[PDB]
Design a protein around this motif. Structure first.
Motif, short mmCIF file in Angstrom:
data_model
loop_
_atom_site.label_atom_id
_atom_site.label_comp_id
_atom_site.label_asym_id
_atom_site.label_seq_id
_atom_site.Cartn_x
_atom_site.Cartn_y
_atom_site.Cartn_z
N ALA A 194 1.15 -1.27 0.12
CA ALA A 194 -0.23 0.38 0.06
C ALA A 194 0.73 1.43 -0.31
O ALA A 194 1.77 1.48 0.90
CB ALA A 194 -0.99 0.12 0.78
N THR A 206 1.13 5.19 0.08
CA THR A 206 0.07 6.83 -0.40
C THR A 206 0.88 7.91 -1.12
O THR A 206 1.62 7.64 -0.98
CB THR A 206 -0.32 7.08 1.18
OG1 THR A 206 -1.11 6.45 2.02
CG2 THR A 206 -0.97 8.77 1.12
N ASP A 213 0.86 11.91 -1.22
CA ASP A 213 0.57 13.00 -1.51
C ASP A 213 0.01 13.99 -2.19
O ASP A 213 1.34 14.59 -2.83
CB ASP A 213 1.07 13.36 0.03
CG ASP A 213 1.06 15.26 0.86
OD1 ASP A 213 0.43 15.89 0.23
OD2 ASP A 213 1.40 15.05 1.95
N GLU A 251 -8.30 12.28 -5.70
CA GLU A 251 -9.23 11.38 -4.09
C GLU A 251 -9.97 10.40 -4.83
O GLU A 251 -11.20 11.08 -5.76
CB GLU A 251 -9.07 13.26 -3.73
CG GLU A 251 -7.95 13.68 -3.64
CD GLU A 251 -8.02 14.29 -1.82
OE1 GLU A 251 -8.33 14.52 -1.16
OE2 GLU A 251 -8.36 15.85 -2.68
N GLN A 284 -10.02 3.99 -6.86
CA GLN A 284 -8.78 3.25 -6.17
C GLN A 284 -7.96 2.53 -7.34
O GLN A 284 -8.40 2.37 -8.09
CB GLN A 284 -9.49 1.71 -5.62
CG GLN A 284 -10.80 2.00 -4.43
CD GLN A 284 -10.85 0.62 -4.41
OE1 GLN A 284 -10.32 0.07 -3.90
NE2 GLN A 284 -11.92 0.08 -4.73
N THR A 310 -2.21 -1.18 -3.14
CA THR A 310 -3.78 -0.58 -3.35
C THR A 310 -2.24 1.03 -3.51
O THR A 310 -1.26 1.21 -2.79
CB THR A 310 -4.16 -0.45 -2.41
OG1 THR A 310 -3.59 0.17 -1.15
CG2 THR A 310 -4.72 -1.06 -2.06
N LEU A 311 -2.96 2.03 -3.97
CA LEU A 311 -2.50 3.31 -3.95
C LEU A 311 -3.10 4.28 -4.19
O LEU A 311 -4.35 4.17 -4.25
CB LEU A 311 -1.30 3.41 -5.55
CG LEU A 311 -0.92 4.76 -5.59
CD1 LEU A 311 0.18 4.69 -6.29
CD2 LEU A 311 -1.38 6.07 -6.02
N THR A 312 -3.32 5.29 -3.11
CA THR A 312 -3.88 6.39 -3.25
C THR A 312 -3.51 7.73 -3.07
O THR A 312 -2.75 7.82 -2.50
CB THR A 312 -4.68 5.72 -1.55
OG1 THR A 312 -4.97 4.32 -0.91
CG2 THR A 312 -6.24 6.64 -1.62
N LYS A 357 -3.57 11.33 -1.35
CA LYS A 357 -4.47 12.24 -0.19
C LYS A 357 -3.77 13.20 0.54
O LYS A 357 -4.36 13.95 1.51
CB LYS A 357 -4.42 11.25 0.85
CG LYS A 357 -5.18 9.84 0.94
CD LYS A 357 -6.46 9.41 2.48
CE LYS A 357 -6.82 11.07 2.81
NZ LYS A 357 -8.09 11.19 2.59
#
Ligand SMILES: [Cu+2]
Ligand SMILES: [Cu+2]
Length: 130
Positions: free
Chosen positions: A19, A21, A23, A104, A107, A126-128, A130
Motif C-alpha cells: 500500500a 500513499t 501526498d 482523491e 482506487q 493499493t495506491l491512494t 491523499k
C-alpha cells in the motif's frame, strides 16, 4: 523524503509494501524499483505497473495478449498511469509520474505484470492519493 517510495521485488515474489500513499502536495511522484536476490529477469522478473483498480484486469488481459516481449503490457496502454521497466536481480528502475494523473477517492492498484511464478499474483498493492 515525501514524493517517492522505494519498493523491492525479491526472489520469493514478494513486494515490500502492499500500500502506497501519494501526498497530493506532490507535483510528481517517484517509485524506485529494485530486485533483491539472485534470480534473473527471465526466471523471476518484476516490474511495477500502476492503474486504477478497475483497469487492472483489462491491463492484464491485453498485456497477456502482448506477451513476454512487451513485459505482458499493451504498449502505450492508455490505462497504465505509470510503469517501470522489467528488472531481474541486481537491477533497478525508477519511474516518475505527474500526480495530476491521480484523483482523491479513486482506487489504484500497483502490480508486477511480469509472470514470475506461483505468487506472481500477490505482487500487488493499493495506491491512494491523499
Ligand atoms: Cu514479479
Ligand atoms: Cu510477476
Amino acid at each position: 523524503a515525501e514524493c517517492s517510495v522505494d519498493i523491492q521485488g525479491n526472489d520469493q515474489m514478494q513486494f515490500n509494501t502492499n500500500a502506497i500513499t501519494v501526498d497530493k502536495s506532490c507535483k510528481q511522484f517517484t517509485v524506485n524499483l529494485s530486485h533483491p536476490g539472485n534470480l534473473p529477469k527471465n526466471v523471476m522478473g518484476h516490474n511495477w505497473v500502476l492503474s486504477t483498480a478497475a483497469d487492472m484486469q483489462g491491463v492484464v488481459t491485453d498485456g497477456m495478449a502482448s506477451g513476454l516481449d512487451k513485459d505482458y503490457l499493451k504498449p502505450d496502454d492508455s490505462r497504465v498511469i505509470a510503469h517501470t521497466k522489467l528488472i531481474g536481480s541486481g537491477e533497478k528502475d525508477s519511474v516518475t509520474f505527474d500526480v495530476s494523473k491521480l484523483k482523491e477517492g479513486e482506487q489504484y492498484m500497483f502490480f508486477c505484470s511480469e509472470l514470475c511464478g506461483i505468487n506472481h499474483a500477490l505482487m500487488k498493492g493499493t495506491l491512494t492519493l491523499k
